[PDB]
Amino acid sequence: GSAKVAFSAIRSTNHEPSEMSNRTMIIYFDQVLVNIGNNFDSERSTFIAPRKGIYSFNFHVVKVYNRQTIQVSLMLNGWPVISAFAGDQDVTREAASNGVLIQMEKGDRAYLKLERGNLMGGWKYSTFSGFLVFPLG
Amino acid sequence: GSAKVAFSAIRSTNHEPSEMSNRTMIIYFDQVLVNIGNNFDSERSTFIAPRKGIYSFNFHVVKVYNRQTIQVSLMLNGWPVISAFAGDQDVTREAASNGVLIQMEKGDRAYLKLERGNLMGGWKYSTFSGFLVFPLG
Amino acid sequence: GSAKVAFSAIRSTNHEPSEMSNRTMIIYFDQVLVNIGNNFDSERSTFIAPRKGIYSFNFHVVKVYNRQTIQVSLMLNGWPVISAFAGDQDVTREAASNGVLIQMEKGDRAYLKLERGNLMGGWKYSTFSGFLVFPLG
Ligand SMILES: *[C@@H]1O[C@H](CO)[C@@H](O)[C@H](O)[C@H]1NC(C)=O
Ligand SMILES: *[C@@H]1O[C@H](CO)[C@@H](O)[C@H](O)[C@H]1NC(C)=O
Numbered sequence A, B, C: 001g002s003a004k005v006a007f008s009a010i011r012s013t014n015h016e017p018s019e020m021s022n023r024t025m026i027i028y029f030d031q032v033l034v035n036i037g038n039n040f041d042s043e044r045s046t047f048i049a050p051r052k053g054i055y056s057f058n059f060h061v062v063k064v065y066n067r068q069t070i071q072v073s074l075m076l077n078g079w080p081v082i083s084a085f086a087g088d089q090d091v092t093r094e095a096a097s098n099g100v101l102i103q104m105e106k107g108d109r110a111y112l113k114l115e116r117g118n119l120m121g122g123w124k125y126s127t128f129s130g131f132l133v134f135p136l137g
């Protein structure tokens, strides 16, 4: 129906991963700046496509020193589409960043999963946003 | 009025920060590749939203070795929305990168500020662009 | 004609650069996830603008340890518009990332070129996507 669809969420705290997050390995975002269409489930940090079309996605997952290197991936219905990486050192914060355009059908689910390493020490300043570029008949 | 709004600017030189830039901590971009709507003030390196809607922003701030780590932030009317970080070493250039979708009202101002560290040694190859995803009634 | 234009391609293998890639220094993407309008030449990894308008581009070129630092650039008809950099170490994968909005005329060619260093060891997980923001009369 609506051709105006976009979401944007950020991690605004250094707080540690939850017990459920330790299980699902899905990255949570507490603050949702944008959510037109209400298609982003903030409770599960997942975007569900309301219709067929081309969707844009971008993420930047920031971490601190924690004796661990990480690999983040954008999951599409349980399968990784793109991935990003970050090293580990006590000099500065570093980010695993990537973006992509993909075709999603109505009901397709998009979310970020931590494939390697952990986010102990928090992942403040992390970002995850997306929008509908255009629908498809 | 116009639903076609986008800007794109780059730093095309290794030249040092200005005296005024040393005061405002705002990151300047000398070369403006795109500026449809003329809503980007190149003199102040700030984007002023012409109307209510969802806007996309992306930036990549590149630096060189200068004994300093930096923190860059996208400011919305003086308040930081998102941030990015870069270490410091004499091996290669590195970039503080991030992006986000946000809702802006008519008159809202968007720009990049250097919250920590300095850009002594220039910040060539740096980028800052944005566009109107869609307006809101 | 069509105002719906977007492409998205990824590198899905650690395989080494080809003999022809060693000559052109152009970065190849074997898997094309999106190609609405069919304006992206997968054989040459180049996007040809079908009409006048503002186009968005984003790329993330991932590499491994190979005793080499790299510089990647988005070429517009043989000239670099933006650039990105990545160091070199055996700790983790790292990415040269950047994005930009640019005005392209009908026939203008956009592609990624490796200006410095090599991608020996493969460039798996690399991404390159773009879309038409809006056309211009
Ligand atoms: C999650 O796992 C880490 C180990 O990687 C552990 O230190 C932490 O306490 C766990 N968090 C919870 C809430 O159980
Ligand atoms: C800006 O401040 C730096 C110190 O961080 C100084 O070295 C530089 O000369 C200053 N630039 C100007 C134009 O005053």
Ligand SMILES: *[C@@H]1O[C@H](CO)[C@@H](O)[C@H](O)[C@H]1NC(C)=O
Residues within 6 Å of the ligand: C017, C018, C019, C022, C118, C120
């Ligand atoms: C490309 O050049 C590298 C040297 O940088 C060489 O090791 C490699 O074998 C070359 N690839 C081909 C296919 O010739």
